[PDB]
Design a protein around this nucleic acid. Structure first.
Ligand SMILES: [Mg+2]
Ligand SMILES: [Mg+2]
Ligand SMILES: [Mg+2]
Ligand SMILES: [Mg+2]
Ligand SMILES: [Mg+2]
Ligand SMILES: [Mg+2]
Ligand SMILES: [Mg+2]
Lengths: 181, 33, 130, 258, 221
RNA sequence: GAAACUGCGAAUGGCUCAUUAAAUCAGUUAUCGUUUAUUUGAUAGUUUACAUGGUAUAACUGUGGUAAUUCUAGA
């Protein structure tokens, strides 16, 4: 038979789902960033845990260790590129200091809100899922899209979007036709 | 008087002009491209 | 308007053709038929339409551009000689061969395997017996 | 099993072929030939997955049946003909000649050569023995039997074989200070100079090899192939000249050239 | 063999003998209605085919020829002024008798005549002699496609120089006597067809002189 | 170019884990202890000939048996 295709889980249930403080923090995060369910928060927590565990393991090694240098440089480069880690904080120690909110900040929904295209984070999500937002020359319909530093400046309304210079949507031309009749 | 012959006549006339204005003719043809 | 760009162009004398990746930018249009691209590629590369083959067109997410793989043979005879039969049928250069469904052909093969020889003698024998 | 196998699953195929694991279920099984199965590159993989001339196996068969591909100056038509180390692949229509040499990463590399350098090959003398009627002969790593060798030629030496006549033009003795190429193990593809041969009677001989960067490594003698004297290789070497580069330095060079 | 491949097999690929390809081959370029690159032109016929043949043919000999001549064929006035060197290189490379470069060279030789035909007349004798040697060479290495290139090259030159050759056919025939008189039947057969096209394009007055000459010659093959 | 003779393949592939506790299997050795279709390279002036037989038959023609089968009998 054909060789296997690998698959993996991108989230894991927390050690204690029932902590009141954890519930309150999840509520705050979901409301602030307009997240649909707890699965998104669990996913981002899983990723951040993976990066921080890797940072711990690399820190454990002796300094100048070639594996330490190479892997730490790669991880810091990736974190700086994705925008979570600032330019001046290129040390594994500051990688270990990251928080979930930083990753939630880079989400395309939050960025679309911040740049002024939407009046609410929920409005940003609706715009994204309705094919109105384009990164560069490309339409993206995924709120969880993680925006890079280079790509943040190219977020705009899509050319095909009615808000981006295309023809009016079905409702607009329908009403215009009815008024004309 | 096929179209190819017409280009020749212009080309031959063009070469005659290049000779009249004038190695030099060779270099100028390179300058054309 | 529609713009066709050819990239990663390789010249294969072994198959006597030219391989490339065709990228078609088609703003404000759903996409471009294979026939129109065949015509345009034939015009650009100065060949017969019959000598141009195109396939693998997948409009990216969000529309506006298509990417696929394109072939330009040196002359039509080579195109007929090397091109797959199915792609020739798509272009009308060749006619689809009509054949029974696989199950019928396999059953006929088995029934013929059952008989030995031409079978005329068996026919005469059964005719005489009954 | 009740006989020889005729199928090769993709996962079980040699790693250095670099085959997609999801394209299909089976991989080309190299037919019997001059080179061993695991140390050979079938022509299908070379024409399709390396040169990209053919898009699929059927086009490869179409190429071969046209008699455009020559291996070692002889036309081959088998899709799975096991081309290997030091074999010359000539494609006359493209006016291209290739010699199959491992790159530093350990994979067969597309190395273009001139026609003159394509006129000959190198072979490791695997055996020297008297045949019938008292005729000495030498068997090389590619299974070529050459009669009437120069008597000084001994096992593990290198012989420069002219493809047109299949005769020895010259030979190199295996001695300290000679330039050698690694053809097996984790050090596959590296180039260096011999430093010393450790001998172990009834066991596998070991050879110490010093690279141009002064790094040293030990390899079993079966994996060493003498290719010339230091600084004077008898064949053109691929890019990198068989020098192993650390991951960090590779990163630096890649970033610089980009 | 008599019972030719009259009933065709279902096979897509089938062997054909060199004699078999020669028998069905026929020298008559006009019948071929396929689009020709030189039919579409911007500067000259020579350039149009030259760029195309750079793309298709990758043979070593043709590559060297292209490099030597690439600079001098960019414009039609360039070609006319440098015609002497252009013809020399074409003849020089064709002499090597390399199959892998013959096809672009024979085509470009015809298109060269197309660009400067009346000017080709001073080159006319050298061209036919070059072709005759090529065809005579081609007998040794059996390649039906080579004969197809050479005779079509002869036909194209014969097409473009129709008016001037028609005036001096007995001279043109004189060049082709070794081909027409050659021992092999097919070489005489092909040369007859290429020469025949001029015969049809004759004024009647010129034809009678031509017919007189050949009958005079008539008094091997 | 049906049928048949001839050559090659059908011992690969696919499926299952019943038996199997130094057995299988993993790593590592050996054949100076042996067979090997095929591929690749070598290799055989020493054995009516303008070329020998049925010591022979298939397919095929024709005559048949059985309720029946990838049954086959005589000429
Ligand atoms: Mg829309
Ligand atoms: Mg031993
Ligand atoms: Mg027990
Ligand atoms: Mg044991
Ligand atoms: Mg076999
Ligand atoms: Mg053999
Ligand atoms: Mg009988």
């Amino acid at each position: 038979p054909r060789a296997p295709r690998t698959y993996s889980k991108t989230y894991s249930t927390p050690k204690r789902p029932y902590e009141s403080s954890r519930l309150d923090a999840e509520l705050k995060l979901a409301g602030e960033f307009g997240l649909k369910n707890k699965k998104e928060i669990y996913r981002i927590s899983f990723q951040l845990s993976k990066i921080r565990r890797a940072a711990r393991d690399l820190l454990t090694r002796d300094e100048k260790d070639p594996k330490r240098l190479f892997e730490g440089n790669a991880l810091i480069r990736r974190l700086v590129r994705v925008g979570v880690l600032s330019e001046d904080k290129k040390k594994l120690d500051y990688v270990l200091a990251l928080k979930v909110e930083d990753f939630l900040e880079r989400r395309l929904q939050t960025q679309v809100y911040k740049l002024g295209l939407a009046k609410s984070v929920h409005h940003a999500r609706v715009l994204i899922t309705q094919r109105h937002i384009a990164v560069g020359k490309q339409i993206v319909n995924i709120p969880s899209f993680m925006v890079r530093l280079d790509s943040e400046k190219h977020i705009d309304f899509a050319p095909t979007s009615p808000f981006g210079g295309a023809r009016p949507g079905r409702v607009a031309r329908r009403n215009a036709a009815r008024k004309a009749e | 008087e096929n179209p190819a012959d017409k280009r020749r006549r212009l080309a031959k006339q063009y070469l005659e002009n290049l000779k009249s204005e004038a190695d030099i003719i060779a270099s100028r043809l390179k300058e054309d491209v | 308007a529609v713009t066709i760009r050819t990239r990663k162009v390789i010249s294969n004398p072994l198959l006597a053709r030219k391989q490339f990746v065709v990228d078609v930018l088609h703003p404000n249009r759903a996409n471009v038929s294979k026939d129109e691209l065949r015509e345009k590629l034939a015009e650009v590369y100065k060949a017969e339409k019959d000598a141009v083959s195109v396939f693998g067109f997948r409009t990216q997410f969000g529309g506006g551009k298509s990417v696929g793989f394109g072939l330009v043979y040196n002359s039509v005879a080579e195109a007929k000689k090397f091109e797959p039969t199915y792609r020739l049928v798509r272009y009308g250069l060749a006619e689809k061969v009509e054949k029974a469904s696989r199950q019928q052909r396999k059953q006929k093969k088995n029934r013929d395997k059952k008989i030995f020889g031409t079978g005329k003698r068996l026919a005469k024998k059964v005719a005489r017996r009954n | 099993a009740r006989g020889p196998k005729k199928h090769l699953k993709r996962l079980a195929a040699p790693h250095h072929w670099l085959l997609d694991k999801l394209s299909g279920c089976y991989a080309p099984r190299p037919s019997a030939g001059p080179h061993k199965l695991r140390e050979s590159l079938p022509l299908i993989v070379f024409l399709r997955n390396r040169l990209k001339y053919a898009l699929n196996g059927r086009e490869v068969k179409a190429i071969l049946m046209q008699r455009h591909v020559k291996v070692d100056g002889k036309v081959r038509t088998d899709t799975t003909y096991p081309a290997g180390f030091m074999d010359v692949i000539t494609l006359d229509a493209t006016n291209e000649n290739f010699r199959l040499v491992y790159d530093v990463k350990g994979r067969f590399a597309v190395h273009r050569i001139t026609d003159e350098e394509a006129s000959y090959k190198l072979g490791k003398v695997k055996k020297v023995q008297l045949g019938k009627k008292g005729v000495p002969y030498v068997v090389t790593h590619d299974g070529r039997t050459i009669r009437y060798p120069d008597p000084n030629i001994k096992v593990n030496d290198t012989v420069k074989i002219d493809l047109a006549s299949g005769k020895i033009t010259d030979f190199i003795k295996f001695d300290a200070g000679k330039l050698v190429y690694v053809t097996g193990g984790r050090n596959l593809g590296r180039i260096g100079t011999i430093v010393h041969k450790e001998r172990h009677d009834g066991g596998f001989d070991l050879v110490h090899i010093k690279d141009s960067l002064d790094n040293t490594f030990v390899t079993r003698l079966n994996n060493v192939f003498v290719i010339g004297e230091q600084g004077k290789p008898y064949i053109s070497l691929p890019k990198g000249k068989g020098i192993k580069l650390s991951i960090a330095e590779e990163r630096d060079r890649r970033r610089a050239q980009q | 063999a008599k019972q030719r491949q009259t009933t065709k097999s279902s096979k897509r690929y089938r062997y054909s003998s060199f004699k078999a390809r020669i028998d069905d081959l026929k020298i008559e370029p006009a019948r071929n209605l396929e689009k020709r690159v030189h039919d579409y032109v911007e500067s000259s016929h020579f350039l149009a085919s030259f760029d195309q043949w750079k793309e298709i043919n990758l043979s070593a000999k043709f590559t060297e020829f292209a490099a030597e001549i690439e600079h001098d064929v960019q414009t039609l006035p360039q070609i006319l002024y440098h015609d002497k060197k252009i013809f020399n290189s074409l003849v020089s490379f064709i002499n090597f008798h390399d199959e892998f470069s013959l096809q672009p060279l024979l085509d470009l030789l015809a298109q060269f005549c197309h660009d400067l035909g009346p000017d080709f007349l001073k080159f006319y004798e050298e061209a036919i002699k070059t072709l005759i040697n090529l065809l005579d060479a081609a007998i040794e290495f059996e390649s039906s496609n080579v004969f197809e290139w050479g005779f079509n090259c002869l036909a194209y030159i014969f097409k473009y120089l129709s008016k001037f050759l028609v005036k001096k056919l007995v001279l043109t025939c004189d060049l082709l006597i070794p081909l027409l008189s050659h021992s092999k039947e097919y070489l005489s057969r092909f040369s007859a067809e290429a020469l025949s096209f001029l015969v049809r394009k004759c004024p009647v007055s010129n034809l009678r002189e031509f017919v007189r000459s050949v009958f005079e010659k008539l008094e091997t093959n």
